[PDB]
């Protein structure tokens, strides 16, 4: 089987304002991004999105989708299941939350089917208990019989959910040249064999074709020129710049990508300040001697380190100061990584 | 893997008194019974059940499951899916029907677990559209993580299931059922076969829902060696007893052979044959009448020239030829012994003999 393209949207919600915080999404989203990139997927990896942001990320993912394209959604964070429908809880959701505060996976699926995708894969790494505060009754709009829908649930209905358990098992099997349903069924068996017994994968599938995440991508279509120019603008990393001060001191300002919305700034001889107010860069979390202290996935072997984890909140250009203890110098680094696409426009 | 026992309940609803009639459940249940028996399953195949009958049959089938038992439930008939929940429509169901009239699959599931089962397979051959009249949404307690439930839906949610020919689901399922593959792997390959078919495209597609975390197949051998299992083996032995063929001698010298054939666990064929016609008698006819009222037999679906005419799955070549056929479905309704009359008209001279053939097939168990 051939794929028109292979696109993936990975959302990892951890930093909940009015709900318990999560840890596993950081490790699981970074690691799944690496595995999917090895399978030649155009991956968009995003952490901690609000309702407004998640809906804009969904729309940006759909513009990357077309006829015969392989679509994959992976979510890890808070979730619930009511009347057959899966809901993904944004980090700005209140306590309690309703359907309107969250994103329904079936609504995304329907939009993906309207783009005539060749494959739809949903890997839902969340709890599947009911939300007793959600009064809403689904407006039953019968989905199309596309026979290319695969759901991979981390747990069974009404049950609970270093890597998280689901990613721990998924990692060891994801690269295999096997039909996605056969591969997920093997992952479910791996969990069954493991002594550490209580949690179980649930697979829902209407897939009628032998489609695998390993399938090769067909030759370039000659609107497809629109899709690939939008993509090549998604992961632009600022060029390492050398700074000159009036005292003769020279500092090298460097950048590294952690996620589509997460970039590490590192100064080598010197601290960074006056970042945009939309970015919510707490100066107590900036300029760490180690990248682990900043909350990064990146360890020291991957000077001073600062993590900008909310690039999706950037409306204008990334302009900030580089202070040397007294002198200051402004730097304009443009719109880095996913800030370059105006996702806010949706 | 190993099974302590392999048990299956097959329900085929067609003759609804308040809803359009169906055709495919007759051939599909018959054909699935054969294949499942070939996989050493104890099978109970029931045609046209009422709410009372369906609830009872399912209650008992849940009981039959013990630790490590392989249980398969198959339904073919009218169905619906409201807000995640699937419902099976009995033949006596009113117009319109509600959940309180139908059997919820999400309920049956919960009661299979409480019996510590080894594999639970649910094959639902029905439409999954919503019922606008069901102004009630059941909310069931957290699905117990037994990690051994496999659901095979003929079609997708909000879509329809399409069709002596098989329905689309059985047409593809019968070709693979006997393969030595994990039930999830097997169902997935049938989904692929359905996909290759010109007729199905954009209309019907099998949907599989599985939580099976072990290499379990319908081809797994039976092991386990229990007192309770012997009771079920004793009860199931009684269940499919067919009356032995009898010869009735009349006053005029005409001998008539009365024969029986099992069609389903609750469906029996009765046939009459003139075995001896004295040269003197040229034109003679034998016919069956005065059957128990519990059975509800149309006398215009009795004493037919061909078995096909009685509404049977069995063709003229599937039984002894040059006879008269009477089909008795509704054996689950028979409370007393099966007593009827055998009439003989010969050129017109009439005579009769009363016949008692005990409690045939499912009627041998009190229900
Ligand atoms: F006919 C109805 F009206 F539907 C009706 N009314 C009432 C009950 C009923 N029970 C049904 C038919 C008999 C079956 N008894 C067995 C026994 C052992 C065993 N071992 N393997 C298998 Cl299989 N069985 N089945 C259980 C289901 N049916």
GROMACS .gro file of N, CA and C and ligand atoms in nm, chain B residues 7-8 42 44 46 49 53 56-57 60 64 232 235-236 332 362 367, ligand 1:
model
   79
  353UNK      N    1  -1.886  -2.299   2.432
  353UNK     CA    2  -2.031  -2.285   2.432
  353UNK      C    3  -2.071  -2.168   2.341
  354UNK      N    4  -2.186  -2.177   2.271
  354UNK     CA    5  -2.237  -2.071   2.184
  354UNK      C    6  -2.389  -2.066   2.177
  388UNK      N    7  -2.052  -2.648   2.181
  388UNK     CA    8  -2.188  -2.691   2.211
  388UNK      C    9  -2.269  -2.568   2.164
  390UNK      N   10  -2.643  -2.376   2.066
  390UNK     CA   11  -2.787  -2.367   2.080
  390UNK      C   12  -2.834  -2.262   1.978
  392UNK      N   13  -3.139  -2.078   1.800
  392UNK     CA   14  -3.280  -2.045   1.819
  392UNK      C   15  -3.331  -1.940   1.722
  395UNK      N   16  -3.728  -1.556   1.858
  395UNK     CA   17  -3.755  -1.550   2.002
  395UNK      C   18  -3.828  -1.421   2.044
  399UNK      N   19  -3.847  -1.512   2.595
  399UNK     CA   20  -3.760  -1.619   2.546
  399UNK      C   21  -3.614  -1.574   2.536
  402UNK      N   22  -3.449  -1.500   2.886
  402UNK     CA   23  -3.432  -1.629   2.949
  402UNK      C   24  -3.311  -1.704   2.892
  403UNK      N   25  -3.309  -1.728   2.759
  403UNK     CA   26  -3.199  -1.791   2.687
  403UNK      C   27  -3.064  -1.724   2.718
  406UNK      N   28  -2.959  -1.789   3.105
  406UNK     CA   29  -2.902  -1.925   3.114
  406UNK      C   30  -2.763  -1.934   3.048
  410UNK      N   31  -2.385  -2.067   3.211
  410UNK     CA   32  -2.302  -2.172   3.148
  410UNK      C   33  -2.155  -2.143   3.148
  578UNK      N   34  -2.389  -2.964   3.251
  578UNK     CA   35  -2.410  -2.888   3.127
  578UNK      C   36  -2.401  -2.980   3.007
  581UNK      N   37  -2.730  -3.179   3.026
  581UNK     CA   38  -2.839  -3.092   2.984
  581UNK      C   39  -2.838  -3.070   2.832
  582UNK      N   40  -2.718  -3.048   2.775
  582UNK     CA   41  -2.698  -3.027   2.632
  582UNK      C   42  -2.720  -3.156   2.552
  678UNK      N   43  -3.986  -2.409   2.171
  678UNK     CA   44  -3.957  -2.347   2.301
  678UNK      C   45  -4.086  -2.307   2.374
  708UNK      N   46  -3.543  -2.890   2.199
  708UNK     CA   47  -3.538  -2.797   2.313
  708UNK      C   48  -3.654  -2.817   2.413
  713UNK      N   49  -3.867  -2.491   3.031
  713UNK     CA   50  -3.831  -2.349   3.021
  713UNK      C   51  -3.953  -2.256   3.039
  714LIG     F1   52  -3.577  -2.121   2.411
  714LIG     C1   53  -3.581  -2.012   2.492
  714LIG     F2   54  -3.708  -1.964   2.486
  714LIG     F3   55  -3.508  -1.917   2.431
  714LIG     C2   56  -3.530  -2.042   2.628
  714LIG     N1   57  -3.611  -2.027   2.733
  714LIG     C3   58  -3.552  -2.053   2.851
  714LIG     C4   59  -3.421  -2.092   2.865
  714LIG     C5   60  -3.347  -2.107   2.750
  714LIG     N2   61  -3.212  -2.147   2.765
  714LIG     C6   62  -3.139  -2.163   2.641
  714LIG     C7   63  -3.161  -2.300   2.578
  714LIG     C8   64  -3.093  -2.412   2.655
  714LIG     C9   65  -2.947  -2.383   2.677
  714LIG     N3   66  -2.895  -2.490   2.761
  714LIG    C10   67  -2.762  -2.528   2.758
  714LIG    C11   68  -2.721  -2.617   2.870
  714LIG    C12   69  -2.594  -2.658   2.874
  714LIG    C13   70  -2.505  -2.618   2.774
  714LIG     N4   71  -2.377  -2.642   2.752
  714LIG     N5   72  -2.340  -2.576   2.637
  714LIG    C14   73  -2.448  -2.515   2.594
  714LIG    CL1   74  -2.464  -2.418   2.455
  714LIG     N6   75  -2.554  -2.537   2.676
  714LIG     N7   76  -2.679  -2.491   2.664
  714LIG    C15   77  -2.927  -2.250   2.747
  714LIG    C16   78  -2.991  -2.137   2.667
  714LIG     N8   79  -3.402  -2.081   2.630
   0.00000   0.00000   0.00000
